[PDB]
Amino acid sequence: NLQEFLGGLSPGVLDRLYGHPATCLAVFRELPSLAKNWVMRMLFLEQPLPQAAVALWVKKEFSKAQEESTGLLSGLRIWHTQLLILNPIFRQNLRIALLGGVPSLDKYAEERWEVVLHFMVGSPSAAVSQDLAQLLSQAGLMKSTEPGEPPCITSAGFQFLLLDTPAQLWYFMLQYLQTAQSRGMDLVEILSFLFQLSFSDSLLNFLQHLREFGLVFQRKRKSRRYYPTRLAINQPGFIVVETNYRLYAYTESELQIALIALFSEMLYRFPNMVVAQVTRESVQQAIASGITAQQIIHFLRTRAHPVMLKQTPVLPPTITDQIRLWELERDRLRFTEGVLYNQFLSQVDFELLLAHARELGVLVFENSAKRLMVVTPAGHSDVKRFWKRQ
């Protein structure tokens, strides 16, 4: 999540991020319910207050909310104990925010995002861009190994495909932000823009990337002014699932058919319907490719035709159950590397070694009756050294 991302940042970058007022408002908005009040309280105050007082302002009931919000803001480093005054920059910058100091767009965003997904799968008709190709490949969801040949999709790439467009886009931006620092792009500049969007050379490159994903659109030959799309700030289903492992996809887009074809066999193609059968051969292939069963049920669940919505569960339980069993069937044998110790002549010392292995956290399985245990090879030397020491 967005708040998750801010927490995983250094104090130096955070204070830099708390620049123009719009950022402080953006970070303020995500304060869950309580801390928003606390921010307003100690906003006009220039003198730190005791930590005990904050604790006693929340009734015993719903006390857990008092601590969790406090921990969240401590992570955000909004205030400091100073022994709980807010950051002088945040207080000042926030005070600036607090009285101080269309239909075409959505279609464009949906289409431009789709072509990226088209490229993700082996779709010959997809947008081609060297920067985009290396972006996805370096994003951890694609791999080429040969610049001349088009890249394939990694194990995580297939899972990314099934995720809903909101989470599908957000995960991509989250990966984009992390790699921005590695490639030499300042994280604060891009991160600050995203917040300001919700309402320089680095931005110009960043804006071009955002234009490529379809989140932003200048419409005026790349003018200074841009018009963000709906997805930039941050739909009815079409699949009918039958009890006999049949999917009737009411799809006109080639991408959705490509998605459904990942984990099912396509039988017939009609302009507003495609007949797909969820055969165990396909699903096992989909699971082998990297997909997780929960995603398949979720992917079919979210794109559920309205007719199935009235039924509960919308997906017939046997289909959902059967898909899971197909997943669990593959992993019947849980392979786990380890080192086995037998011929435990020292029965008394076997327990001592057992206790030592447990303390180190290396032991995986043990059998007291047979006086044997298995330890991962990583810790094999440690136990081997312990045995040699005697």
Add this chain to the structure above:
Amino acid sequence: AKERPIWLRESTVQG
């Protein structure tokens, strides 16, 4: 009033 058994009523799959 003679409700269905647990196994038939709700899924028994671990997942």
Add this chain to the structure above:
Amino acid sequence: VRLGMMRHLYVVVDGSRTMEDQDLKPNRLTCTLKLLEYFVEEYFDQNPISQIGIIVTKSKRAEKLTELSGNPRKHITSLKKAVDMTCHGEPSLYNSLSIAMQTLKHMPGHTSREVLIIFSSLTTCDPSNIYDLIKTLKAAKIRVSVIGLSAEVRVCTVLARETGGTYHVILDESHYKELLTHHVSPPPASSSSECSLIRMGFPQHTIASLSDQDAKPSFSMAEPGLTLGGYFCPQCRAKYCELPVECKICGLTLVSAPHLARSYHHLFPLDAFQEIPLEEYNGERFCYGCQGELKDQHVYVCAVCQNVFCVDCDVFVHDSLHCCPGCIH
């Protein structure tokens, strides 16, 4: 028309088998219970000094589900319990009316006695003739206003008109709310009905005098723990947890000042506002009451203040606020 400010109304509900039938969306018995809760909750909200008592008549027997009281929460609780009632038997109107008459016979003259019978099964098996009872009711000045369900039964037809009440039938569930909602208002007092002054006392809420000095510990008066402060009485000197409750000792009604002020809007009903669709020289595009643009060809005005009120404002003013905003000035 002078109304009965204080009224003692009994909501007699039939536990007949016909209530089992589902002509409406939910079970008929549940629906009446669900909606009767609205009337009970709303009944006191628009007449505090009044008191209500529910009766359920099933299997030819009329059992007092709840006695006369002033706490809507207690009555509503019984309604929730009655949802799972067996609802198997045949009602007896004579039994129901007789039960109400006994309790209402001893009521003070000033109060306006009433009864509301929710009739569901057209059949009425009774131990004795009801026409003798009907004569007694008129001498007892009890207003019985039946609300039939899916039947214009003759027996009830004479009952309402002969006894002075009003008879109605449920055209549909939505119409059902209108019928009961009408009975919420204090029915006008007829020529036969009389009025008299009623004694009452206003219980001043009291708490610990000065840091638990000369404190007044006590638990309640109808697992209540000790209470630092609570309503007292001019005469009982008894700790009453909540108001308005009749003195368990004096027999004198205890009621706070706001409750009496709640019913004044009945005395001074607001004159309806003439509806003129065209602008009619009204140069204010925004409604005066709500300062919102009028997107409809509709306007309302008073006879004194002569202000402009949209449909939303007029619907609100005559529904809840019971007063004209601007015309107050």
Add this chain to the structure above:
Amino acid sequence: LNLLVIVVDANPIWWGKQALKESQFTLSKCIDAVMVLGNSHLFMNRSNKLAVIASHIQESRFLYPGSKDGKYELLTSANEVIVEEIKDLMTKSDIKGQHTETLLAGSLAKALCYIHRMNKEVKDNQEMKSRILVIKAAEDSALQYMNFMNVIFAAQKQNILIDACVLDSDSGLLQQACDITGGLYLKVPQMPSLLQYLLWVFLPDQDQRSQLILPPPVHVDYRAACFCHRNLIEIGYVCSVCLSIFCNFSPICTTCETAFKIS
């Protein structure tokens, strides 16, 4: 979401007396505190909406239905409309010696219907929790008790809070209102520090007010007085027509003209 409504009592006579007194507290600061209080509320979340209402001896008018200073653009518009609107109302006004007491029930009546007008407009998906942050600044009017009493009940029926924040005089009638509807009450004695009371006591919404420690409710004296005298009476006599608290036994109560029969 929440629909806050700041029914400010901008009484020129009282606020003007402060100007003549040349006290530190002044109306301009009060509107700023309301302004900052208003900005913070919307600032909490996008879905929130607010409204501001003034009061005067004549009539009460709504004060509310790029980023030059750098603040949020939306808040910029609210400040402009409120700043200009209040000045017009204060500067322009007639004179009526007979009527000099501030009116608040009328202003509230404009507030209660606004939520209902706004409650209809809001879509079925989103449930709204409206509130009225009445900020009284002058004594109540005797003739307005009945009118004010009807609006309060309308609020309770529709579940709108009245968080009275009276100052410089404890309004016995207003403190009654906040109790009936579940609203908060507060008699701030440090008028210059008025805003900090607002951000603490009044700013948090109802869904969050419960999970918070706030000043305990003040005792409300539900006094009842006879219509002869206007003196507190503990045992009152009323008739089933007037429903009028009366001093002592009379053969017939004057307001009724009923042919009361002895017994």
Add this chain to the structure above:
Amino acid sequence: GPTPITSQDIINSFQSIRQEMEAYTPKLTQVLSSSAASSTITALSPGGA
């Protein structure tokens, strides 16, 4: 109802307030101060008034 309880002052007060707000938007400092805001918090404490 039951709830219980010169001319130039209206004129004098009305004119004085009329000229008060010709200076507006003092929000930067006039609305609150550290001393004034802090005093309110202390009052809101259980010990405070």
